[PDB]
Each structure stands twice: as C-alpha cells, then as structure tokens.
C-alpha cells in the first residue's frame, strides 16, 4: 500500500463514548496487638512479651497498606483544589448532560450513572465489614467494645467520605464541561461548550468549520452514545467486573480470616483461660503456644495477601491518576490511550472504590486515495498551498486539509507563488481562479 503519486485521506468521521473503569482504593483494616495475642485472658503479660514482635511487624505492614491506599485515593481524587458552583442549565448547544451532571433535586446529589454504579456495586450482607458497620453505631467510643468481639479486627474508615469524592467529581465535571482547565493553576476563562469542542477539534487537526457544519450530527451521536452506555452498564454484568471482583475478594479474605479465627486447631478449646485451668502449666504452655502459632500463621497469610492486593491496587491507582492527569485535565496527544481513536474529552464519575472515565473518541472512516501533485503551474509560476494539499477528485483539482476531505476551489488566497514551474518536480498544469478578474470584467 505504497505509492509516489497518491495520498489517502479520510472521508467520514464518527464520535463515540467509551467507559474505562479503574479501582482506586480498598477497605482498610487493622489488628489490635493487645487483644489478638491476649484474647479473653486475665493475665497475658508474658504471652505479649513472647509474641509481640511479629504482631508489631504485621501492624506496621497494615498501617503502611492503609496509608498507601489513602495517599492513592487522595492523589487520584484531589488533583485540583479550586472550585466553583454548578451550572443550573443542563443543555449546552444541544448536548445532553443529564446523566453526567448531578441532580440537585435528589438529596443524594449524584448522577444517574453514579446512582446505577452505586446500586450495582454492593457488599455481601453476611460479611465482617457489614457486621462491623452495624456494631459500630456511628461512634468511636464503641470501637473497642466491638473489636473485643472480633479480637482486634477493625475497619478503618476512609479519609475521604463519599460526599467529598462526589463533590470533587462534580467540580471536575463542571470545570470540564464549562470553561476549561489550564496546565496548572485552576479553571480557565469562561467559554461556550461548542467553542471549546471546536478548539479541541483544531487541536486534533480538524478545522472548526467541520464542527460548525456538523454540530447537530455530533450532538445526536453523543446523546445516543450516552443513552446506550447506561443500558449497556445496566444489562451487561461483566462491565463492572473489576470493582465487584475486588470487593468479593476482600470480603472472602475477611470471611476466611474470621472463620480461621474461630478454629480450635489442635487444642482442647479456643478459650485461652480454659486450657490453663483444665491443664497443668507445663502442658498448658505448649497447648497455648500452638494456638498462638496457628493464629500468627493465619494472620501472616492474610497480611501477605493484603500486601499483594495493595500493590495491585496501587498500580491501578497510579494508572488512573496518570490517565486523569493526561486526558481529563487537558487534551492528550497519545493515540488509543483514552479510547480507540483520537481523544477529545473526559467526564470522570465516581463509583464505590473506583473511578469511571467517559472518554470521547473521534474516529475517521471511509479512507479514500486520490492523486496528488506537489505544485500547480498557472502562468509559468509555481503555486504552493498555504495550509493543505492538492487533491484530484478524478477530473478537477482542489485544495484539502490533510486529515479530512474538504474540496475547495483553487484561488489566489489559498496559494502563494514561489519560484518557477521548471525547478519543481511533479508540477501539474491547472488554472488558478482570481476573484478580482470577474469583478473587473463585470465593469466592462
């Protein structure tokens, strides 16, 4: 597919909306050393002194995991600090943002897409997280009382609540839909959305007249894609596979941990005091040491699994953060990085422990090859196009942009003269229309 006298240019263009889901954080947890090792024991100073080192190491690892998760979610969801109020209007030049813009009427202050994501992503009722949430009672004074039941197992609340994440997402949506985002600082000057989209088309290499002559078509395509994405998310269960899989993995890890907690292993009973009460001290020592070793091994397996999951989630959160930095806050020059085609805009939305990007993609289609000539000779003087290339439709010659087919007649304003026709190789004989000639001839 190579030629020395032909050029291939697109003829038609399409606008698509793609959804990219990326997890950003998990459910933080911690274990109490003074209660996991000790348990329901009247005196456990010697046991604590014997077995506190590994418990402290595991607690430090859990603290590191929690701080890494909090740092990741803060980095991915607090890139911009400046904010301003929401736009009351929902339509901007025919584009419908009802599913994206939050609805102030609903008390949840969320979007229909966000509401669907929250409803379709839940947690198992028969889980440790749900029981801990029910027993917490929305008070920090009762944390220890319920932690005694779970032997120090606690769920650390996230640093940023759902309301803060929703507010940040709404502010980002406002800053993207209206005005714009500069490379740093904060929001840019106010500008109508069609003009911003025309600027984006100019950035990707398409003249704004294409948008202005096809505003209705692109608006209809965007509305259809927005309407279809909700149905695709609601119907297809595999769309939200990543977040649901992560939640289920965390839930099953916690469930197997708490199940192994109640296991008696190889002792008379799980009660530490009963072993020493019903047995002599020398035998009770090993009968408790075996239980301690089993619990420590189970906790080590849980913490190493949590470390692996935390590393994976950290990688995913870094990918999400760099995607937001490159595509959400500004136009991205990379091809197929945000979608499949040319990235135009991104509309982030929040989901339980995740962020969804609605990438807008420009896709050329109907590529056609036409004969091209480097220069045109009219009156023994080479003419070169100011911005574009010469394309022949088979019988006539026109000047067209590289990235689109816009046949325009040859005029003295679209071309400039330089040199003679003999020096240039590939000269083609054609007539260059001068608009002054008919006006001067009309006088006669």
């Amino acid at each position, epitope marked *: 597919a190579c030629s020395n006298n032909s050029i291939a240019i697109p003829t038609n263009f399409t606008i698509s909306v793609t959804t990219e889901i990326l997890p950003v954080s998990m459910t933080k947890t911690s274990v109490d050393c003074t209660m996991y090792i000790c348990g329901d024991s009247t005196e456990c100073s010697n046991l604590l002194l014997q077995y506190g080192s590994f418990c402290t190491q595991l607690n430090r690892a859990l603290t590191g995991i929690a701080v890494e998760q909090d740092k990741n979610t803060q980095e991915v969801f607090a890139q911009v600090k400046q904010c301003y109020k929401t736009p009351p209007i929902k339509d901007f030049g025919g584009f419908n943002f009802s599913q994206i813009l939050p609805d102030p009427s609903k008390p949840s202050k969320r979007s229909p897409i966000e509401d669907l994501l929250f409803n379709k992503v839940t947690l198992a009722d028969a889980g440790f997280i749900k029981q801990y949430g029910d027993c917490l009672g929305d008070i920090a004074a009762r944390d*220890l009382i319920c932690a*005694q039941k779970f032997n120090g197992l606690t769920v650390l609340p996230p640093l940023l609540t759902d309301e803060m994440i929703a507010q940040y997402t709404s502010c980002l949506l406002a800053g993207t839909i209206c005005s714009g985002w500069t490379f740093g600082a904060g929001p840019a000057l106010q500008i109508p959305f069609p003009m911003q989209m025309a600027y984006r088309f100019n950035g990707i290499g398409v003249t704004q007249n294409v948008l202005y002559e096809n505003q209705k078509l692109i608006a209809n395509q965007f509305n259809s894609a927005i309407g279809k994405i909700q149905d695709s998310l609601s119907s297809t269960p595999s769309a939200l596979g990543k977040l649901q899989d992560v939640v289920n993995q965390n839930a099953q890890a916690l469930n197997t941990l708490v199940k192994q907690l109640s296991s008696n292993f190889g002792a008379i009973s799980s009660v530490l005091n009963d072993i020493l009460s019903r047995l002599d001290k020398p035998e009770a020592e090993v009968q408790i040491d075996r239980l301690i070793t089993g619990r420590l091994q189970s906790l080590q397996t849980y913490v190493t699994q949590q470390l692996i999951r935390a590393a994976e989630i950290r990688a995913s959160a870094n990918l999400a953060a760099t995607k937001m930095s490159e595509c959400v806050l500004g136009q991205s020059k990379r091809v197929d990085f945000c979608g499949k085609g040319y990235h135009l805009m991104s509309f982030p939305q929040s989901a339980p422990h995740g962020v969804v990007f609605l990438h807008v993609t420009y896709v050329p289609a109907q590529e056609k090859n036409f004969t091209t000539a480097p220069a045109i000779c009219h009156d023994g003087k080479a003419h070169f196009p100011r911005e574009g290339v010469f394309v022949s439709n088979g019988t006539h010659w026109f000047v067209t942009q590289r990235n689109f087919y816009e046949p325009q007649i040859i005029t003295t304003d679209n071309t400039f003269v330089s040199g003679n026709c003999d020096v240039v190789i590939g000269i083609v004989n054609n007539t260059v229309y001068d608009p002054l000639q008919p006006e001067l001839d009309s006088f006669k």
Partner: antibody, heavy 125, light 106 residues
Framework: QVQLVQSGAEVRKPGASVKVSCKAS????????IHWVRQAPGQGLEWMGW????????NYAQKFQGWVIMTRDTSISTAYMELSRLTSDDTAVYYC????????????????????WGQGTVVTV | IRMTQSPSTLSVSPGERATLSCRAS??????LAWYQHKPGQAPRLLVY???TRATGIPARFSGSGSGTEFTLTISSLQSEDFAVYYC???????????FGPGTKVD
C-alpha cells in the same frame, strides 16, 4: 462531664499492701484502656502497666511485675491497684489515666496517648 | 529506648516565642506526645502525634519534627504556661512506655 477521681493520700508501713481506687465518670467505663504511672520525688515518670476494663487483661512492666495487681469493677466502674511488699523506694505519686486521642485514621486502637488523667495519690513509707 | 529533652530550664519574657527539643535513642516515627505537668495539677495532653494538638488546646502551642528529633514551640509564654514539659512515647515495640526527663520554663 468526663472525670477521673483518685483516693486520698494514704500512709502504710513497709511490707504492706496499698489499695488505690480510680473511678471514671462521664463516659462508658468499658472500651477504653486505663494506665497507671508513677512520679517519684525528683525523678521522672514510669509506666507501671495497664488493665483492660472490658475483658480484664493486665499487663505490667518487668520492674513492677508481681508487686502490682490490677482489678476492675464494671458495676461501679472502679479500677483497684493493689501493691505488695512495700519498699522504701516506693514513695511516689500514682496517677491513673485513660488512653485516648487516637487517630481514627491511619492508626489502630493499640497506639494512643493519654488525654484525661486523675488527681494523684501520694504514698509514704 | 531512652528519651532526652533540652534544655533544662528557660528564661523567656512574657509574650515571646520559645522552643523545646526532644530526642530518642532510636527511631520513634510519630508515636510521641508532649505533656504539661503543673506542680499542683495532674499532667495534661497538649500535642499528640507528630503535630496534632489535643482538644481544648489553644493554637499557640505547636509541634514539629520527625524521625528521632521533635520540637515543641509556644508563640507567647504566659502564666498558665509555667509547668514542666515531658515527652511520652507510646510505641508498642518496645513494650515499656518511656517518659521524658522533664524541662522547666520561666
């Protein structure tokens, strides 16, 4: 409303038992670790140990191991510290404090700093 | 673990910023707290953690530092700020909770 009340100053002969009672008011007695500290005249502060009012677990330091017995009474919400083998070097002021000020984020229940203290009981040999 | 404070005493006029340094033999991370003990009153918590202040503590008190070295600063010395300052470490390892030697102010 939260307050910690300690017993008054008491004097005991050497090689005797001293019972110091610490009472808590304004909050639920269970669910918060209670620690004891000793301030010697002209010296620093030494952490004697701690007791869990919920279960009853007592952990003491190596120096104070055996000499100190900590008991709890959730019915009236009182922590009793009983000393044994009163030595002439035990003359100090004993304070009971509640471990709190916990960072609800990034931290677990074990790591805490005392926020409310008692009044202080002075013992003389 | 050993905790050492500096200096032993200060002579600061009222309404003047003052600072006190504290250090440990090994790394302590953010498990350090500052306590103010009056001669006739029980010690009270002023700053817990690296720089977080306790409830009811005025903004004049502040804390800084990390690793093994921390510092406590006061914007203006007043009559209520005439007590002894102690450093308390609540790190689980080692199990003992070593206190600070103490520092007087004037």
């Amino acid at each position: 409303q939260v307050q910690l009340v300690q017993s008054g100053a008491e004097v005991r002969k050497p090689g005797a038992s001293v019972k110091v009672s610490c009472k808590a008011s304004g909050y639920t007695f269970t669910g918060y670790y209670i620690h004891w500290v000793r301030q010697a005249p002209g010296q620093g502060l030494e952490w004697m140990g701690w007791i869990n009012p919920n279960s009853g677990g007592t952990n003491y330091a190596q120096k104070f191991q055996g000499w100190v017995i900590m008991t709890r009474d959730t019915s009236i919400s009182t922590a009793y510290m009983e000393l044994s083998r009163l030595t002439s070097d035990d003359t100090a002021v004993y304070y009971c404090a509640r471990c709190g000020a916990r960072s609800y984020y990034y931290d677990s229940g074990d790591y805490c700093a005392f926020d409310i203290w008692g009044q202080g009981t002075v013992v003389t040999v | 673990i050993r905790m050492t404070q500096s200096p032993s005493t200060l002579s600061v006029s009222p309404g003047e910023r003052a600072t006190l340094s504290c250090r440990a033999s090994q790394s302590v991370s953010s498990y350090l707290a500052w306590y103010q003990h009056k001669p006739g009153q029980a010690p009270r918590l002023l700053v817990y953690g690296a720089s977080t202040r306790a409830t009811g503590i005025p903004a004049r008190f502040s804390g800084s530092g990390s690793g093994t070295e921390f510092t406590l600063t006061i914007s203006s010395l007043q009559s209520e700020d005439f007590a002894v300052y102690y450093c308390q470490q609540y790190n689980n390892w080692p199990p003992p909770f070593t206190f600070g030697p103490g520092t007087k102010v004037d």
